[PDB]
């Protein structure tokens, strides 16, 4: 059950996803979906837990600027919700994610390792043991 996800931030409230699913027997599955900031916010048990989770991811990038902490923390929440849905649909224990550059600044190695850790941490806390690989 190969899972490859392409992430494109349309705006600061919209994230577009394109996923390719490759099964062991050769069945391929091409999918598109758009997740909004409001849908990420409403997927949490409460407004308090949503803003608490957002603070934790911001704390992962305290060395970065306020604009970058705003983009990266909300980006992690969107991708985490997506990989959460994919794990409920296919049960894959490994996902490969490719993120398009946001506002003319590609992700460097330290930021990608932090994003990977943040997503895996949020997934493991909901009982989803998923290895995230960022291309």
PDB file of N, CA and C in Angstrom, residues 5-95:
ATOM      1  N   UNK A   5       2.113  11.557  -1.166  1.00  0.00           N
ATOM      2  CA  UNK A   5       1.263  12.729  -0.995  1.00  0.00           C
ATOM      3  C   UNK A   5       2.025  13.963  -1.450  1.00  0.00           C
ATOM      4  N   UNK A   6       1.374  14.779  -2.270  1.00  0.00           N
ATOM      5  CA  UNK A   6       1.896  16.062  -2.715  1.00  0.00           C
ATOM      6  C   UNK A   6       1.086  17.166  -2.053  1.00  0.00           C
ATOM      7  N   UNK A   7       1.776  18.104  -1.408  1.00  0.00           N
ATOM      8  CA  UNK A   7       1.142  19.161  -0.629  1.00  0.00           C
ATOM      9  C   UNK A   7       1.476  20.502  -1.263  1.00  0.00           C
ATOM     10  N   UNK A   8       0.445  21.308  -1.509  1.00  0.00           N
ATOM     11  CA  UNK A   8       0.595  22.647  -2.064  1.00  0.00           C
ATOM     12  C   UNK A   8      -0.239  23.607  -1.231  1.00  0.00           C
ATOM     13  N   UNK A   9       0.418  24.564  -0.582  1.00  0.00           N
ATOM     14  CA  UNK A   9      -0.301  25.605   0.142  1.00  0.00           C
ATOM     15  C   UNK A   9      -0.817  26.625  -0.864  1.00  0.00           C
ATOM     16  N   UNK A  10      -2.137  26.672  -1.038  1.00  0.00           N
ATOM     17  CA  UNK A  10      -2.739  27.653  -1.935  1.00  0.00           C
ATOM     18  C   UNK A  10      -2.699  29.039  -1.300  1.00  0.00           C
ATOM     19  N   UNK A  11      -3.260  29.161  -0.099  1.00  0.00           N
ATOM     20  CA  UNK A  11      -3.140  30.363   0.714  1.00  0.00           C
ATOM     21  C   UNK A  11      -2.989  29.930   2.167  1.00  0.00           C
ATOM     22  N   UNK A  12      -2.913  30.907   3.071  1.00  0.00           N
ATOM     23  CA  UNK A  12      -2.711  30.592   4.482  1.00  0.00           C
ATOM     24  C   UNK A  12      -3.922  29.926   5.126  1.00  0.00           C
ATOM     25  N   UNK A  13      -5.007  29.716   4.383  1.00  0.00           N
ATOM     26  CA  UNK A  13      -6.186  29.029   4.892  1.00  0.00           C
ATOM     27  C   UNK A  13      -6.597  27.849   4.020  1.00  0.00           C
ATOM     28  N   UNK A  14      -5.775  27.464   3.044  1.00  0.00           N
ATOM     29  CA  UNK A  14      -6.149  26.418   2.099  1.00  0.00           C
ATOM     30  C   UNK A  14      -4.920  25.604   1.721  1.00  0.00           C
ATOM     31  N   UNK A  15      -5.055  24.279   1.766  1.00  0.00           N
ATOM     32  CA  UNK A  15      -3.988  23.360   1.392  1.00  0.00           C
ATOM     33  C   UNK A  15      -4.545  22.303   0.450  1.00  0.00           C
ATOM     34  N   UNK A  16      -3.920  22.166  -0.715  1.00  0.00           N
ATOM     35  CA  UNK A  16      -4.338  21.215  -1.735  1.00  0.00           C
ATOM     36  C   UNK A  16      -3.446  19.981  -1.672  1.00  0.00           C
ATOM     37  N   UNK A  17      -4.062  18.803  -1.736  1.00  0.00           N
ATOM     38  CA  UNK A  17      -3.357  17.533  -1.638  1.00  0.00           C
ATOM     39  C   UNK A  17      -3.641  16.675  -2.864  1.00  0.00           C
ATOM     40  N   UNK A  18      -2.597  16.030  -3.379  1.00  0.00           N
ATOM     41  CA  UNK A  18      -2.718  15.031  -4.435  1.00  0.00           C
ATOM     42  C   UNK A  18      -2.010  13.768  -3.971  1.00  0.00           C
ATOM     43  N   UNK A  19      -2.743  12.659  -3.917  1.00  0.00           N
ATOM     44  CA  UNK A  19      -2.230  11.407  -3.379  1.00  0.00           C
ATOM     45  C   UNK A  19      -2.294  10.314  -4.435  1.00  0.00           C
ATOM     46  N   UNK A  20      -1.235   9.512  -4.508  1.00  0.00           N
ATOM     47  CA  UNK A  20      -1.193   8.324  -5.349  1.00  0.00           C
ATOM     48  C   UNK A  20      -1.060   7.099  -4.456  1.00  0.00           C
ATOM     49  N   UNK A  21      -1.979   6.153  -4.616  1.00  0.00           N
ATOM     50  CA  UNK A  21      -1.989   4.909  -3.856  1.00  0.00           C
ATOM     51  C   UNK A  21      -1.641   3.780  -4.812  1.00  0.00           C
ATOM     52  N   UNK A  22      -0.617   3.003  -4.470  1.00  0.00           N
ATOM     53  CA  UNK A  22      -0.203   1.856  -5.267  1.00  0.00           C
ATOM     54  C   UNK A  22      -0.350   0.597  -4.427  1.00  0.00           C
ATOM     55  N   UNK A  23      -1.245  -0.292  -4.842  1.00  0.00           N
ATOM     56  CA  UNK A  23      -1.475  -1.536  -4.126  1.00  0.00           C
ATOM     57  C   UNK A  23      -0.510  -2.615  -4.607  1.00  0.00           C
ATOM     58  N   UNK A  24      -0.425  -3.694  -3.824  1.00  0.00           N
ATOM     59  CA  UNK A  24       0.520  -4.764  -4.132  1.00  0.00           C
ATOM     60  C   UNK A  24       0.185  -5.461  -5.444  1.00  0.00           C
ATOM     61  N   UNK A  25      -1.093  -5.519  -5.809  1.00  0.00           N
ATOM     62  CA  UNK A  25      -1.518  -6.235  -7.005  1.00  0.00           C
ATOM     63  C   UNK A  25      -1.530  -5.365  -8.256  1.00  0.00           C
ATOM     64  N   UNK A  26      -1.093  -4.110  -8.162  1.00  0.00           N
ATOM     65  CA  UNK A  26      -1.015  -3.237  -9.314  1.00  0.00           C
ATOM     66  C   UNK A  26      -2.121  -2.212  -9.436  1.00  0.00           C
ATOM     67  N   UNK A  27      -3.098  -2.217  -8.532  1.00  0.00           N
ATOM     68  CA  UNK A  27      -4.156  -1.216  -8.576  1.00  0.00           C
ATOM     69  C   UNK A  27      -3.615   0.138  -8.136  1.00  0.00           C
ATOM     70  N   UNK A  28      -3.807   1.152  -8.973  1.00  0.00           N
ATOM     71  CA  UNK A  28      -3.371   2.506  -8.672  1.00  0.00           C
ATOM     72  C   UNK A  28      -4.581   3.402  -8.437  1.00  0.00           C
ATOM     73  N   UNK A  29      -4.414   4.359  -7.529  1.00  0.00           N
ATOM     74  CA  UNK A  29      -5.507   5.193  -7.047  1.00  0.00           C
ATOM     75  C   UNK A  29      -5.017   6.632  -6.991  1.00  0.00           C
ATOM     76  N   UNK A  30      -5.629   7.506  -7.783  1.00  0.00           N
ATOM     77  CA  UNK A  30      -5.245   8.911  -7.855  1.00  0.00           C
ATOM     78  C   UNK A  30      -6.330   9.759  -7.206  1.00  0.00           C
ATOM     79  N   UNK A  31      -5.933  10.636  -6.284  1.00  0.00           N
ATOM     80  CA  UNK A  31      -6.892  11.367  -5.468  1.00  0.00           C
ATOM     81  C   UNK A  31      -6.469  12.820  -5.307  1.00  0.00           C
ATOM     82  N   UNK A  32      -7.469  13.694  -5.188  1.00  0.00           N
ATOM     83  CA  UNK A  32      -7.273  15.108  -4.903  1.00  0.00           C
ATOM     84  C   UNK A  32      -8.249  15.537  -3.818  1.00  0.00           C
ATOM     85  N   UNK A  33      -7.808  16.470  -2.978  1.00  0.00           N
ATOM     86  CA  UNK A  33      -8.660  16.991  -1.919  1.00  0.00           C
ATOM     87  C   UNK A  33      -8.073  18.296  -1.405  1.00  0.00           C
ATOM     88  N   UNK A  34      -8.953  19.173  -0.930  1.00  0.00           N
ATOM     89  CA  UNK A  34      -8.576  20.478  -0.402  1.00  0.00           C
ATOM     90  C   UNK A  34      -9.028  20.573   1.047  1.00  0.00           C
ATOM     91  N   UNK A  35      -8.091  20.861   1.944  1.00  0.00           N
ATOM     92  CA  UNK A  35      -8.374  21.003   3.367  1.00  0.00           C
ATOM     93  C   UNK A  35      -8.232  22.470   3.741  1.00  0.00           C
ATOM     94  N   UNK A  36      -9.255  23.011   4.394  1.00  0.00           N
ATOM     95  CA  UNK A  36      -9.261  24.399   4.826  1.00  0.00           C
ATOM     96  C   UNK A  36      -8.824  24.504   6.282  1.00  0.00           C
ATOM     97  N   UNK A  37      -8.427  25.718   6.670  1.00  0.00           N
ATOM     98  CA  UNK A  37      -8.015  25.958   8.049  1.00  0.00           C
ATOM     99  C   UNK A  37      -9.163  25.708   9.016  1.00  0.00           C
ATOM    100  N   UNK A  38     -10.387  26.063   8.613  1.00  0.00           N
ATOM    101  CA  UNK A  38     -11.546  25.831   9.467  1.00  0.00           C
ATOM    102  C   UNK A  38     -11.808  24.344   9.672  1.00  0.00           C
ATOM    103  N   UNK A  39     -11.545  23.518   8.657  1.00  0.00           N
ATOM    104  CA  UNK A  39     -11.748  22.081   8.806  1.00  0.00           C
ATOM    105  C   UNK A  39     -10.705  21.469   9.731  1.00  0.00           C
ATOM    106  N   UNK A  40      -9.472  21.982   9.691  1.00  0.00           N
ATOM    107  CA  UNK A  40      -8.460  21.542  10.648  1.00  0.00           C
ATOM    108  C   UNK A  40      -8.855  21.960  12.056  1.00  0.00           C
ATOM    109  N   UNK A  41      -9.337  23.196  12.204  1.00  0.00           N
ATOM    110  CA  UNK A  41      -9.713  23.700  13.519  1.00  0.00           C
ATOM    111  C   UNK A  41     -10.857  22.891  14.115  1.00  0.00           C
ATOM    112  N   UNK A  42     -11.866  22.571  13.305  1.00  0.00           N
ATOM    113  CA  UNK A  42     -13.029  21.838  13.786  1.00  0.00           C
ATOM    114  C   UNK A  42     -12.757  20.356  14.011  1.00  0.00           C
ATOM    115  N   UNK A  43     -11.648  19.822  13.497  1.00  0.00           N
ATOM    116  CA  UNK A  43     -11.326  18.416  13.709  1.00  0.00           C
ATOM    117  C   UNK A  43     -10.796  18.134  15.109  1.00  0.00           C
ATOM    118  N   UNK A  44     -10.559  19.163  15.916  1.00  0.00           N
ATOM    119  CA  UNK A  44     -10.084  18.980  17.278  1.00  0.00           C
ATOM    120  C   UNK A  44     -11.255  18.965  18.251  1.00  0.00           C
ATOM    121  N   UNK A  45     -11.051  18.288  19.385  1.00  0.00           N
ATOM    122  CA  UNK A  45     -12.123  18.121  20.361  1.00  0.00           C
ATOM    123  C   UNK A  45     -12.634  19.458  20.876  1.00  0.00           C
ATOM    124  N   UNK A  46     -11.772  20.470  20.921  1.00  0.00           N
ATOM    125  CA  UNK A  46     -12.155  21.772  21.439  1.00  0.00           C
ATOM    126  C   UNK A  46     -11.251  22.833  20.832  1.00  0.00           C
ATOM    127  N   UNK A  47     -11.685  24.088  20.957  1.00  0.00           N
ATOM    128  CA  UNK A  47     -10.839  25.201  20.545  1.00  0.00           C
ATOM    129  C   UNK A  47      -9.594  25.292  21.415  1.00  0.00           C
ATOM    130  N   UNK A  48      -9.697  24.866  22.675  1.00  0.00           N
ATOM    131  CA  UNK A  48      -8.554  24.914  23.579  1.00  0.00           C
ATOM    132  C   UNK A  48      -7.480  23.912  23.173  1.00  0.00           C
ATOM    133  N   UNK A  49      -7.880  22.699  22.779  1.00  0.00           N
ATOM    134  CA  UNK A  49      -6.890  21.710  22.364  1.00  0.00           C
ATOM    135  C   UNK A  49      -6.256  22.078  21.029  1.00  0.00           C
ATOM    136  N   UNK A  50      -7.020  22.708  20.133  1.00  0.00           N
ATOM    137  CA  UNK A  50      -6.466  23.139  18.853  1.00  0.00           C
ATOM    138  C   UNK A  50      -5.370  24.180  19.052  1.00  0.00           C
ATOM    139  N   UNK A  51      -5.629  25.183  19.892  1.00  0.00           N
ATOM    140  CA  UNK A  51      -4.635  26.225  20.121  1.00  0.00           C
ATOM    141  C   UNK A  51      -3.489  25.726  20.991  1.00  0.00           C
ATOM    142  N   UNK A  52      -3.743  24.727  21.839  1.00  0.00           N
ATOM    143  CA  UNK A  52      -2.656  24.113  22.594  1.00  0.00           C
ATOM    144  C   UNK A  52      -1.727  23.330  21.674  1.00  0.00           C
ATOM    145  N   UNK A  53      -2.294  22.566  20.737  1.00  0.00           N
ATOM    146  CA  UNK A  53      -1.475  21.838  19.774  1.00  0.00           C
ATOM    147  C   UNK A  53      -0.698  22.797  18.880  1.00  0.00           C
ATOM    148  N   UNK A  54      -1.318  23.918  18.504  1.00  0.00           N
ATOM    149  CA  UNK A  54      -0.632  24.893  17.664  1.00  0.00           C
ATOM    150  C   UNK A  54       0.551  25.518  18.394  1.00  0.00           C
ATOM    151  N   UNK A  55       0.404  25.772  19.699  1.00  0.00           N
ATOM    152  CA  UNK A  55       1.522  26.302  20.474  1.00  0.00           C
ATOM    153  C   UNK A  55       2.681  25.316  20.511  1.00  0.00           C
ATOM    154  N   UNK A  56       2.378  24.023  20.651  1.00  0.00           N
ATOM    155  CA  UNK A  56       3.435  23.020  20.734  1.00  0.00           C
ATOM    156  C   UNK A  56       4.255  22.969  19.451  1.00  0.00           C
ATOM    157  N   UNK A  57       3.600  23.098  18.298  1.00  0.00           N
ATOM    158  CA  UNK A  57       4.325  23.052  17.034  1.00  0.00           C
ATOM    159  C   UNK A  57       5.087  24.350  16.799  1.00  0.00           C
ATOM    160  N   UNK A  58       4.513  25.487  17.203  1.00  0.00           N
ATOM    161  CA  UNK A  58       5.261  26.740  17.170  1.00  0.00           C
ATOM    162  C   UNK A  58       6.525  26.643  18.013  1.00  0.00           C
ATOM    163  N   UNK A  59       6.441  25.963  19.160  1.00  0.00           N
ATOM    164  CA  UNK A  59       7.601  25.804  20.029  1.00  0.00           C
ATOM    165  C   UNK A  59       8.698  24.967  19.386  1.00  0.00           C
ATOM    166  N   UNK A  60       8.370  24.181  18.359  1.00  0.00           N
ATOM    167  CA  UNK A  60       9.393  23.436  17.637  1.00  0.00           C
ATOM    168  C   UNK A  60      10.275  24.343  16.790  1.00  0.00           C
ATOM    169  N   UNK A  61       9.800  25.541  16.452  1.00  0.00           N
ATOM    170  CA  UNK A  61      10.503  26.466  15.572  1.00  0.00           C
ATOM    171  C   UNK A  61      10.737  27.814  16.248  1.00  0.00           C
ATOM    172  N   UNK A  62      11.074  27.801  17.541  1.00  0.00           N
ATOM    173  CA  UNK A  62      11.242  29.056  18.271  1.00  0.00           C
ATOM    174  C   UNK A  62      12.388  29.893  17.715  1.00  0.00           C
ATOM    175  N   UNK A  63      13.378  29.253  17.090  1.00  0.00           N
ATOM    176  CA  UNK A  63      14.477  29.995  16.483  1.00  0.00           C
ATOM    177  C   UNK A  63      14.054  30.744  15.228  1.00  0.00           C
ATOM    178  N   UNK A  64      12.912  30.403  14.642  1.00  0.00           N
ATOM    179  CA  UNK A  64      12.488  31.019  13.396  1.00  0.00           C
ATOM    180  C   UNK A  64      11.635  32.257  13.673  1.00  0.00           C
ATOM    181  N   UNK A  65      11.348  33.005  12.609  1.00  0.00           N
ATOM    182  CA  UNK A  65      10.613  34.253  12.741  1.00  0.00           C
ATOM    183  C   UNK A  65       9.137  33.982  13.027  1.00  0.00           C
ATOM    184  N   UNK A  66       8.405  35.061  13.314  1.00  0.00           N
ATOM    185  CA  UNK A  66       6.981  34.931  13.608  1.00  0.00           C
ATOM    186  C   UNK A  66       6.191  34.540  12.366  1.00  0.00           C
ATOM    187  N   UNK A  67       6.577  35.066  11.200  1.00  0.00           N
ATOM    188  CA  UNK A  67       5.912  34.684   9.959  1.00  0.00           C
ATOM    189  C   UNK A  67       6.151  33.215   9.635  1.00  0.00           C
ATOM    190  N   UNK A  68       7.372  32.729   9.869  1.00  0.00           N
ATOM    191  CA  UNK A  68       7.684  31.336   9.575  1.00  0.00           C
ATOM    192  C   UNK A  68       7.024  30.396  10.576  1.00  0.00           C
ATOM    193  N   UNK A  69       6.952  30.799  11.848  1.00  0.00           N
ATOM    194  CA  UNK A  69       6.257  29.982  12.837  1.00  0.00           C
ATOM    195  C   UNK A  69       4.766  29.906  12.549  1.00  0.00           C
ATOM    196  N   UNK A  70       4.197  30.959  11.963  1.00  0.00           N
ATOM    197  CA  UNK A  70       2.786  30.934  11.595  1.00  0.00           C
ATOM    198  C   UNK A  70       2.544  30.005  10.413  1.00  0.00           C
ATOM    199  N   UNK A  71       3.440  30.022   9.425  1.00  0.00           N
ATOM    200  CA  UNK A  71       3.262  29.181   8.247  1.00  0.00           C
ATOM    201  C   UNK A  71       3.526  27.716   8.571  1.00  0.00           C
ATOM    202  N   UNK A  72       4.610  27.440   9.300  1.00  0.00           N
ATOM    203  CA  UNK A  72       5.021  26.056   9.518  1.00  0.00           C
ATOM    204  C   UNK A  72       4.072  25.325  10.461  1.00  0.00           C
ATOM    205  N   UNK A  73       3.627  25.988  11.529  1.00  0.00           N
ATOM    206  CA  UNK A  73       2.747  25.321  12.484  1.00  0.00           C
ATOM    207  C   UNK A  73       1.397  24.990  11.858  1.00  0.00           C
ATOM    208  N   UNK A  74       0.834  25.916  11.077  1.00  0.00           N
ATOM    209  CA  UNK A  74      -0.432  25.636  10.407  1.00  0.00           C
ATOM    210  C   UNK A  74      -0.254  24.636   9.272  1.00  0.00           C
ATOM    211  N   UNK A  75       0.914  24.635   8.624  1.00  0.00           N
ATOM    212  CA  UNK A  75       1.193  23.632   7.602  1.00  0.00           C
ATOM    213  C   UNK A  75       1.240  22.234   8.204  1.00  0.00           C
ATOM    214  N   UNK A  76       1.897  22.091   9.359  1.00  0.00           N
ATOM    215  CA  UNK A  76       1.988  20.787  10.010  1.00  0.00           C
ATOM    216  C   UNK A  76       0.602  20.279  10.384  1.00  0.00           C
ATOM    217  N   UNK A  77      -0.259  21.168  10.887  1.00  0.00           N
ATOM    218  CA  UNK A  77      -1.606  20.752  11.271  1.00  0.00           C
ATOM    219  C   UNK A  77      -2.395  20.244  10.070  1.00  0.00           C
ATOM    220  N   UNK A  78      -2.239  20.892   8.914  1.00  0.00           N
ATOM    221  CA  UNK A  78      -2.972  20.471   7.725  1.00  0.00           C
ATOM    222  C   UNK A  78      -2.489  19.113   7.233  1.00  0.00           C
ATOM    223  N   UNK A  79      -1.169  18.919   7.178  1.00  0.00           N
ATOM    224  CA  UNK A  79      -0.624  17.650   6.708  1.00  0.00           C
ATOM    225  C   UNK A  79      -0.926  16.536   7.704  1.00  0.00           C
ATOM    226  N   UNK A  80      -0.899  16.852   9.002  1.00  0.00           N
ATOM    227  CA  UNK A  80      -1.217  15.851  10.016  1.00  0.00           C
ATOM    228  C   UNK A  80      -2.646  15.351   9.862  1.00  0.00           C
ATOM    229  N   UNK A  81      -3.589  16.264   9.625  1.00  0.00           N
ATOM    230  CA  UNK A  81      -4.972  15.853   9.416  1.00  0.00           C
ATOM    231  C   UNK A  81      -5.108  14.997   8.163  1.00  0.00           C
ATOM    232  N   UNK A  82      -4.352  15.325   7.113  1.00  0.00           N
ATOM    233  CA  UNK A  82      -4.441  14.560   5.874  1.00  0.00           C
ATOM    234  C   UNK A  82      -3.902  13.146   6.059  1.00  0.00           C
ATOM    235  N   UNK A  83      -2.689  13.021   6.604  1.00  0.00           N
ATOM    236  CA  UNK A  83      -2.123  11.700   6.861  1.00  0.00           C
ATOM    237  C   UNK A  83      -2.970  10.918   7.856  1.00  0.00           C
ATOM    238  N   UNK A  84      -3.696  11.620   8.726  1.00  0.00           N
ATOM    239  CA  UNK A  84      -4.630  10.962   9.632  1.00  0.00           C
ATOM    240  C   UNK A  84      -5.770  10.315   8.856  1.00  0.00           C
ATOM    241  N   UNK A  85      -6.344  11.050   7.901  1.00  0.00           N
ATOM    242  CA  UNK A  85      -7.417  10.498   7.080  1.00  0.00           C
ATOM    243  C   UNK A  85      -6.917   9.350   6.215  1.00  0.00           C
ATOM    244  N   UNK A  86      -5.726   9.496   5.632  1.00  0.00           N
ATOM    245  CA  UNK A  86      -5.182   8.441   4.785  1.00  0.00           C
ATOM    246  C   UNK A  86      -4.922   7.168   5.580  1.00  0.00           C
ATOM    247  N   UNK A  87      -4.444   7.304   6.820  1.00  0.00           N
ATOM    248  CA  UNK A  87      -4.215   6.120   7.640  1.00  0.00           C
ATOM    249  C   UNK A  87      -5.522   5.420   7.987  1.00  0.00           C
ATOM    250  N   UNK A  88      -6.608   6.178   8.149  1.00  0.00           N
ATOM    251  CA  UNK A  88      -7.902   5.558   8.398  1.00  0.00           C
ATOM    252  C   UNK A  88      -8.475   4.908   7.145  1.00  0.00           C
ATOM    253  N   UNK A  89      -8.027   5.329   5.963  1.00  0.00           N
ATOM    254  CA  UNK A  89      -8.547   4.793   4.711  1.00  0.00           C
ATOM    255  C   UNK A  89      -7.736   3.620   4.184  1.00  0.00           C
ATOM    256  N   UNK A  90      -6.430   3.583   4.456  1.00  0.00           N
ATOM    257  CA  UNK A  90      -5.564   2.555   3.897  1.00  0.00           C
ATOM    258  C   UNK A  90      -4.689   1.847   4.921  1.00  0.00           C
ATOM    259  N   UNK A  91      -4.538   2.387   6.129  1.00  0.00           N
ATOM    260  CA  UNK A  91      -3.751   1.726   7.151  1.00  0.00           C
ATOM    261  C   UNK A  91      -2.275   1.611   6.854  1.00  0.00           C
ATOM    262  N   UNK A  92      -1.743   2.457   5.976  1.00  0.00           N
ATOM    263  CA  UNK A  92      -0.331   2.380   5.629  1.00  0.00           C
ATOM    264  C   UNK A  92       0.532   2.903   6.770  1.00  0.00           C
ATOM    265  N   UNK A  93       1.612   2.182   7.057  1.00  0.00           N
ATOM    266  CA  UNK A  93       2.535   2.540   8.124  1.00  0.00           C
ATOM    267  C   UNK A  93       3.666   3.444   7.650  1.00  0.00           C
ATOM    268  N   UNK A  94       3.692   3.802   6.367  1.00  0.00           N
ATOM    269  CA  UNK A  94       4.722   4.680   5.829  1.00  0.00           C
ATOM    270  C   UNK A  94       4.114   5.542   4.735  1.00  0.00           C
ATOM    271  N   UNK A  95       4.356   6.849   4.809  1.00  0.00           N
ATOM    272  CA  UNK A  95       3.852   7.809   3.835  1.00  0.00           C
ATOM    273  C   UNK A  95       5.010   8.683   3.375  1.00  0.00           C
TER     274      UNK A  95
END
